């Protein structure tokens, strides 16, 4: 009486994987929106500096702005990498369970 | 039964002495990341402060308030990034203190 558990347990751990996959695709969108929002005041400062500030001093300003660009760039890519790690862990768990199902068929034999 | 008596005393020495070396090096780890944070926090604000200074001299008075607002919006972001990092380090500190207390109150033989 293996399929009773193994087939029913596997169909549920599988669907659990498919929900975490969706949940991850959503955290991807959230990072991008967060990445956008985090850059809005920086971009604001780019535009506003054009109108208000000495042109011969504005390049020193843009350099600072770029410096802040990098910090944000490092923060978002770091996050992006975390979510890529998660994307592997889920995929790993999926294949595992795939390989569990193919051998369970053999057990039901 | 003094041979099992001796064997237990040795694994307890090994156990105690090992957990104590772990914690000492984690504490040293934690303190390093702590100063790493207070360094990262200041370096993350250096360009922000640079702009504050530079905008005073180079930008029209009537518009610099708008700039300073945007600067503040960015400071808030760094603020959240650091404090959250700060709270991660505070979590590690309790973890170690936990492991320490687990080792002290089972003994308590002074």
Residue numbers in the entry:
A (entry chain B): 7 to 115
B (entry chain A): 1 to 110
Which text from the study accompanies this structure?
Bacterial type VIIb secretion systems (T7SSb) are multisubunit integral membrane protein complexes found in Firmicutes that play a role in both bacterial competition and virulence by secreting toxic effector proteins. The majority of characterized T7SSb effectors adopt a polymorphic domain architecture consisting of a conserved N-terminal Leu-X-Gly (LXG) domain and a variable C-terminal toxin domain. Using coimmunoprecipitation-mass spectrometry analyses, in vitro copurification experiments, and T7SSb secretion assays, we found that representative members of these protein families form heteromeric complexes with their cognate LXG domain and in doing so, function as targeting factors that promote effector export. Additionally, an X-ray crystal structure of a representative DUF3958 protein, combined with predictive modeling of DUF3130 using AlphaFold2, revealed structural similarity between these protein families and the ubiquitous WXG100 family of T7SS effectors.
Despite this discouraging trend, LapD2 was the sole exception and after systematic optimization of its crystallization conditions it formed crystals that diffracted to 2.2 Å. The crystallographic phase problem was overcome using selenomethionine-incorporated protein and the single wavelength anomalous dispersion (SAD) technique. The overall structure of LapD2 shows that it adopts a helix-turn-helix fold that is reminiscent of the WXG100 family of small secreted T7SS effectors. However, in contrast to characterized WXG100 proteins, which typically form head-to-toe homodimers mediated by hydrophobic interactions, the turn region of LapD2 contains an intermolecular disulfide bond formed by cysteine 59 that facilitates head-to-head dimerization. The head region of LapD2 also possesses a hydrophobic patch that may contribute to dimerization. Not surprisingly, the energy of head-to-head dimer formation as predicted by the PDBePISA webtool is highly favorable (ΔiG = −21.0) due to the combined effects of burying a hydrophobic patch from the aqueous milieu and possessing a disulfide linkage. PDBePISA also revealed a toe-to-toe homodimer interface, and this interaction was also suggested to be favorable, although with a lower energy of formation (ΔiG = −11.6). Notably, conservation is very low within the interhelical turn region, which contrasts with the highly conserved WXG motif found within structurally similar WXG100 proteins. One of the more striking features of LapD2 is the disulfide bond formed by Cys59 that contributes to dimerization. This residue is not conserved among Lap2 proteins indicating that an intermolecular disulfide bond is likely not a universal property of this protein family. Consistent with not playing an important role in LapD2 function, we found that an S. intermedius GC1825 ΔlapD2 strain expressing plasmid-borne LapD2C59S secretes wild-type levels of TelD.
